[PDB]
């Protein structure tokens, strides 16, 4: 939980 900071560069691949 808490404040999530995203780095879209490191998204997991779609499957």
């Amino acid at each position: 939980n808490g404040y999530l900071v995203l780095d879209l560069s490191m998204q997991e691949a779609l499957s």
Partner: antibody
Amino acid sequence: EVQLQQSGPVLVKPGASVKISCKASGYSFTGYYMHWVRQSNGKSLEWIGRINPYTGVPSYKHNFKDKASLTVDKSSSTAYMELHSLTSEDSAVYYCARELGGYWGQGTTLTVSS
Amino acid sequence: QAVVTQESALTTSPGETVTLTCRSSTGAVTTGNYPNWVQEKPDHLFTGLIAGTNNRAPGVPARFSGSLIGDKAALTITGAQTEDEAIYFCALWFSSHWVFGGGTKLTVLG
């Protein structure tokens, strides 16, 4: 819409320092990392580092650790990169990018020359 | 140490399909390298295309798609358009930093 507005071109002399800005608009600034990238003629694209705007923690590529300092102003939703001990080899176009495969700033051309 | 290599230049025609590849000197490229792809148009105009192997950025036409082909990352343009004439860079993640490929100049014969 998202906008990453960088500061304008700058000419400085060797040995000085410069602070480049990147004003983020159109999204939650503290909800995403910010990356910094350098484009030179002789070295092409190099990743400088990224910064977590919520925690303020920066991460650097090893070769930029003593060259660049990344900071943010949460109040204005602006990311900053300060370059130290400038040499002619630091002349390049510098970009901020929320993600490498996404939104990029327009670039800031830095000329370091005596 | 980790060097990323792309094709220097490629040529295709409008309506055709072209594939750009992105390889690593240290080993095979996998989803753990989180391949990102970005397009550069003249005058330093960068537009992100693909993040995390195959997550297409919002607003990017569907003709752009990312994948892994064998031991390399790949950007496929299905039905290339003349406005796709540009330079395309890949970036790979190596544990604690990103490394960009040298870029591929793509010609779409107009």
